[PDB]
Design a protein around this motif. Structure first.
Motif, PDB file in Angstrom:
ATOM      1  N   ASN A 149      16.814  19.856 -60.881  1.00 21.21           N
ATOM      2  CA  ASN A 149      15.509  20.254 -61.532  1.00 21.21           C
ATOM      3  C   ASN A 149      14.559  19.052 -61.610  1.00 21.21           C
ATOM      4  N   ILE A 150      13.560  19.127 -62.501  1.00 17.80           N
ATOM      5  CA  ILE A 150      12.551  18.068 -62.726  1.00 17.80           C
ATOM      6  C   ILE A 150      11.474  18.506 -63.728  1.00 17.80           C
ATOM      7  N   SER A 151      10.298  17.886 -63.626  1.00 16.34           N
ATOM      8  CA  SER A 151       9.153  18.165 -64.495  1.00 16.34           C
ATOM      9  C   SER A 151       7.865  17.803 -63.750  1.00 16.34           C
ATOM     10  CB  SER A 151       9.275  17.359 -65.788  1.00 16.34           C
ATOM     11  OG  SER A 151       8.064  17.370 -66.523  1.00 16.34           O
ATOM     12  N   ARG A 152       6.748  18.443 -64.102  1.00 13.98           N
ATOM     13  CA  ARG A 152       5.496  18.278 -63.341  1.00 13.98           C
ATOM     14  C   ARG A 152       4.819  16.900 -63.458  1.00 13.98           C
ATOM     15  NH1 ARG A 152       0.724  22.181 -61.203  1.00 13.98           N
ATOM     16  NH2 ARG A 152      -0.846  20.537 -60.898  1.00 13.98           N
ATOM     17  N   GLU A 153       4.436  16.494 -64.673  1.00 15.97           N
ATOM     18  CA  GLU A 153       3.786  15.186 -64.879  1.00 15.97           C
ATOM     19  C   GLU A 153       4.772  14.029 -64.678  1.00 15.97           C
ATOM     20  OE1 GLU A 153       2.393  13.517 -68.611  1.00 15.97           O
ATOM     21  OE2 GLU A 153       1.764  11.878 -67.302  1.00 15.97           O
ATOM     22  N   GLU A 154       6.056  14.306 -64.901  1.00 22.87           N
ATOM     23  CA  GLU A 154       7.114  13.348 -64.600  1.00 22.87           C
ATOM     24  C   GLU A 154       7.240  13.149 -63.089  1.00 22.87           C
ATOM     25  N   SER A 155       7.061  14.232 -62.323  1.00 24.60           N
ATOM     26  CA  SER A 155       7.213  14.219 -60.858  1.00 24.60           C
ATOM     27  C   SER A 155       6.041  13.602 -60.094  1.00 24.60           C
ATOM     28  CB  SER A 155       7.488  15.635 -60.325  1.00 24.60           C
ATOM     29  N   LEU A 156       4.819  13.991 -60.462  1.00 19.28           N
ATOM     30  CA  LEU A 156       3.615  13.680 -59.678  1.00 19.28           C
ATOM     31  C   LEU A 156       3.274  12.186 -59.597  1.00 19.28           C
ATOM     32  N   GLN A 157       3.885  11.379 -60.464  1.00 20.65           N
ATOM     33  CA  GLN A 157       3.781   9.925 -60.362  1.00 20.65           C
ATOM     34  C   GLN A 157       5.161   9.263 -60.237  1.00 20.65           C
ATOM     35  OE1 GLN A 157       0.958   6.445 -62.190  1.00 20.65           O
ATOM     36  NE2 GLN A 157       0.479   8.108 -60.753  1.00 20.65           N
ATOM     37  N   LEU A 158       5.870   9.585 -59.152  1.00 18.23           N
ATOM     38  CA  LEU A 158       7.157   8.960 -58.848  1.00 18.23           C
ATOM     39  C   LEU A 158       6.936   7.595 -58.195  1.00 18.23           C
ATOM     40  N   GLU A 159       7.299   7.476 -56.918  1.00 14.42           N
ATOM     41  CA  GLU A 159       7.124   6.235 -56.148  1.00 14.42           C
ATOM     42  C   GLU A 159       7.762   6.369 -54.770  1.00 14.42           C
ATOM     43  N   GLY A 160       6.946   6.734 -53.785  1.00 11.36           N
ATOM     44  CA  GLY A 160       7.409   6.882 -52.408  1.00 11.36           C
ATOM     45  C   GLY A 160       7.824   8.293 -52.042  1.00 11.36           C
ATOM     46  N   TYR A 161       8.318   9.043 -53.030  1.00 11.44           N
ATOM     47  CA  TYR A 161       8.836  10.400 -52.825  1.00 11.44           C
ATOM     48  C   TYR A 161       7.802  11.333 -52.178  1.00 11.44           C
ATOM     49  N   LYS A 162       8.243  12.143 -51.214  1.00 10.95           N
ATOM     50  CA  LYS A 162       7.361  13.097 -50.528  1.00 10.95           C
ATOM     51  C   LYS A 162       7.271  14.421 -51.299  1.00 10.95           C
ATOM     52  N   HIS A 163       6.073  15.009 -51.338  1.00  9.06           N
ATOM     53  CA  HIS A 163       5.804  16.219 -52.140  1.00  9.06           C
ATOM     54  C   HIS A 163       5.564  17.484 -51.307  1.00  9.06           C
ATOM     55  CE1 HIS A 163       5.556  15.056 -56.420  1.00  9.06           C
ATOM     56  NE2 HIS A 163       5.255  13.855 -55.959  1.00  9.06           N
ATOM     57  N   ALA A 164       6.145  18.602 -51.735  1.00 11.16           N
ATOM     58  CA  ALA A 164       5.926  19.871 -51.053  1.00 11.16           C
ATOM     59  C   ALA A 164       5.597  20.979 -52.035  1.00 11.16           C
ATOM     60  CB  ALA A 164       7.136  20.263 -50.201  1.00 11.16           C
ATOM     61  N   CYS A 165       4.795  21.929 -51.561  1.00  9.72           N
ATOM     62  CA  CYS A 165       4.436  23.092 -52.335  1.00  9.72           C
ATOM     63  C   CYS A 165       4.737  24.354 -51.555  1.00  9.72           C
ATOM     64  CB  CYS A 165       2.959  23.047 -52.686  1.00  9.72           C
ATOM     65  SG  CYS A 165       2.593  21.838 -53.934  1.00  9.72           S
ATOM     66  N   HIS A 166       5.422  25.285 -52.205  1.00 10.80           N
ATOM     67  CA  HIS A 166       5.640  26.606 -51.622  1.00 10.80           C
ATOM     68  C   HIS A 166       5.370  27.683 -52.667  1.00 10.80           C
ATOM     69  CE1 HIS A 166       8.134  23.889 -49.043  1.00 10.80           C
ATOM     70  NE2 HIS A 166       7.564  24.597 -48.085  1.00 10.80           N
ATOM     71  N   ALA A 167       4.981  28.867 -52.193  1.00 10.37           N
ATOM     72  CA  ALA A 167       4.581  29.968 -53.072  1.00 10.37           C
ATOM     73  C   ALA A 167       5.242  31.299 -52.710  1.00 10.37           C
ATOM     74  CB  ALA A 167       3.082  30.118 -53.060  1.00 10.37           C
ATOM     75  N   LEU A 168       5.637  32.035 -53.751  1.00  7.42           N
ATOM     76  CA  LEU A 168       5.975  33.449 -53.625  1.00  7.42           C
ATOM     77  C   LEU A 168       4.764  34.284 -53.982  1.00  7.42           C
ATOM     78  CD1 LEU A 168       7.524  36.046 -53.355  1.00  7.42           C
ATOM     79  CD2 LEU A 168       8.604  35.593 -55.567  1.00  7.42           C
ATOM     80  N   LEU A 169       4.277  35.048 -53.012  1.00  7.66           N
ATOM     81  CA  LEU A 169       3.201  36.007 -53.242  1.00  7.66           C
ATOM     82  C   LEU A 169       3.845  37.370 -53.315  1.00  7.66           C
ATOM     83  CD1 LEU A 169       0.631  34.624 -50.663  1.00  7.66           C
ATOM     84  CD2 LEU A 169       1.081  33.893 -52.984  1.00  7.66           C
ATOM     85  N   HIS A 170       3.472  38.155 -54.322  1.00  4.17           N
ATOM     86  CA  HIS A 170       4.079  39.478 -54.542  1.00  4.17           C
ATOM     87  C   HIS A 170       3.107  40.519 -55.116  1.00  4.17           C
ATOM     88  CE1 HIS A 170       4.575  39.134 -58.997  1.00  4.17           C
ATOM     89  NE2 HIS A 170       4.459  37.854 -58.688  1.00  4.17           N
ATOM     90  N   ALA A 171       3.459  41.792 -54.958  1.00  2.90           N
ATOM     91  CA  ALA A 171       2.635  42.892 -55.459  1.00  2.90           C
ATOM     92  C   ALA A 171       3.495  44.110 -55.824  1.00  2.90           C
ATOM     93  CB  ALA A 171       1.578  43.263 -54.434  1.00  2.90           C
ATOM     94  N   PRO A 172       3.110  44.858 -56.875  1.00  4.97           N
ATOM     95  CA  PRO A 172       3.854  46.069 -57.263  1.00  4.97           C
ATOM     96  C   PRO A 172       3.768  47.156 -56.187  1.00  4.97           C
ATOM     97  CG  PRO A 172       1.767  45.957 -58.431  1.00  4.97           C
ATOM     98  CD  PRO A 172       1.946  44.629 -57.745  1.00  4.97           C
ATOM     99  N   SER A 173       4.784  48.013 -56.111  1.00  4.67           N
ATOM    100  CA  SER A 173       4.819  49.035 -55.066  1.00  4.67           C
ATOM    101  C   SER A 173       5.488  50.320 -55.499  1.00  4.67           C
ATOM    102  CB  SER A 173       5.490  48.517 -53.797  1.00  4.67           C
ATOM    103  OG  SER A 173       5.840  49.601 -52.965  1.00  4.67           O
ATOM    104  N   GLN A 174       4.776  51.413 -55.257  1.00  6.98           N
ATOM    105  CA  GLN A 174       5.257  52.752 -55.562  1.00  6.98           C
ATOM    106  C   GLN A 174       6.128  53.318 -54.430  1.00  6.98           C
ATOM    107  OE1 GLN A 174       4.142  52.894 -58.780  1.00  6.98           O
ATOM    108  NE2 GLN A 174       3.063  51.057 -58.016  1.00  6.98           N
ATOM    109  N   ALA A 175       6.183  52.634 -53.291  1.00  7.86           N
ATOM    110  CA  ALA A 175       6.875  53.190 -52.114  1.00  7.86           C
ATOM    111  C   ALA A 175       8.381  53.379 -52.345  1.00  7.86           C
ATOM    112  CB  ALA A 175       6.600  52.342 -50.825  1.00  7.86           C
ATOM    113  N   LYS A 176       8.947  54.420 -51.728  1.00  5.23           N
ATOM    114  CA  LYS A 176      10.393  54.657 -51.789  1.00  5.23           C
ATOM    115  C   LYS A 176      11.028  54.737 -50.384  1.00  5.23           C
TER     116      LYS A 176
END
Ligand SMILES: [Mn+2]
Ligand SMILES: [Mn+2]
Ligand SMILES: [Mn+2]
Ligand SMILES: [Mn+2]
Ligand SMILES: [Mn+2]
Lengths: 191, 190
Positions: free
Chosen positions: B1-28
């Motif tokens: 794990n980790i933390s946001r403000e703890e993470s964003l000022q590390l030292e040398g470490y490479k940063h990545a961002c990924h996202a889950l995009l989702h939507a509700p669905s009535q389909a069966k």
């Protein structure tokens, strides 16, 4: 999973039949502008969370194997297949089994123009089966990356339906994409 | 794990961002099994499943501006209008034996039609057929055989801690309880 000829399997009684096709096209594109794509090969994520080829069950007392394939391709891939004729010339092999159920699977392989493949992908979202039986279209990575795993080997570590993993490896051979040693190699790097 | 403000000022470490995009669905599914929700993932160039996103140079524009870019690059032009704000942030993990990386995970609920337009123009993305070998939807249900659907889906080959993150989302969105999640992995693992 046993090999059998087309004619012999069609003379069988009380078997269920399925047809599945690999649609493919040559490409000049290079991944990262260095690694050649070589060819586009289409597969899918299925409703069951497994990778497979498009196609499905065909009632041979009702329609031909090609006719059944056609209908299932249009359902699964979408309207762009109305311009696509998968004929008897495209037929490749047939495997048979009695367990768990008496089932014969037919495999087709069909070359298309790149823009054809691309139209299919663009229009797949409009398929009757999109977001239902078909969860999305996917291209098979044909390369191994410098780390000796990324690409085809790692991809072969995904979860495949029936004999689809074996059908793909056959197509790689059939289309002269990989030598038998390269294939054996990929399978080792895959663990 | 980790933390946001703890993470964003590390030292040398490479940063990545990924996202889950989702939507509700009535389909069966077979007019029986509810889809519940549409969750986007993808097949990568390396043969693994993952979420869209990528590397973002920490000193070169904000964590959100990195992500939004890598989204338009991978998912396509449609995304220009998607608003993946600071409020869409969710977590970070630290690794070392690999490259020493900080992965930031983002979950954003969109409307179904928006997901539909994203899948429809995904073929136009700069990275379609390059980094991105195709989008997929995550089956959330479990079939009568008690393996097909999500448990079979978790046996696929996932990049990084991509699987971890997805399990988080399913709890995060109250889609499955913890025991249901455990049931799924026990079915998955065997
Ligand atoms: Mn099918
Ligand atoms: Mn079907
Ligand atoms: Mn990047
Ligand atoms: Mn990227
Ligand atoms: Mn990426």
């Amino acid at each position: 999973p046993r090999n059998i000829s087309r004619e012999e399997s069609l003379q069988l009684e009380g078997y269920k039949h399925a047809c599945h096709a690999l649609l493919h096209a040559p490409s000049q594109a290079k991944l990262f502008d260095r690694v050649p794509i070589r060819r586009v090969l289409l597969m899918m994520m299925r409703f069951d969370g497994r990778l497979g080829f498009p196609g499905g069950f065909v009632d041979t007392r009702d329609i031909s194997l090609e006719e059944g394939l056609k209908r299932e391709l249009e359902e699964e891939l979408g309207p762009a297949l109305a311009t696509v004729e998968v004929t008897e010339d495209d037929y490749r092999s047939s495997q048979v089994r009695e367990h768990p159920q008496k089932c014969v699977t037919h495999f087709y392989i069909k070359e298309l123009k790149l823009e054809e493949i691309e139209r299919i992908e663009a229009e797949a979202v409009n398929a009757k089966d999109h977001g239902l039986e078909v969860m999305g279209l996917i291209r098979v990575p044909l390369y191994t990356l410098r780390d000796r795993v990324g690409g085809l080997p790692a991809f072969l570590c995904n979860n495949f339906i029936g004999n689809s993993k074996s059908q793909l490896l056959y197509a790689l051979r059939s289309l002269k994409l990989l030598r038998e040693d390269q294939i054996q190699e990929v399978l080792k790097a895959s663990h």
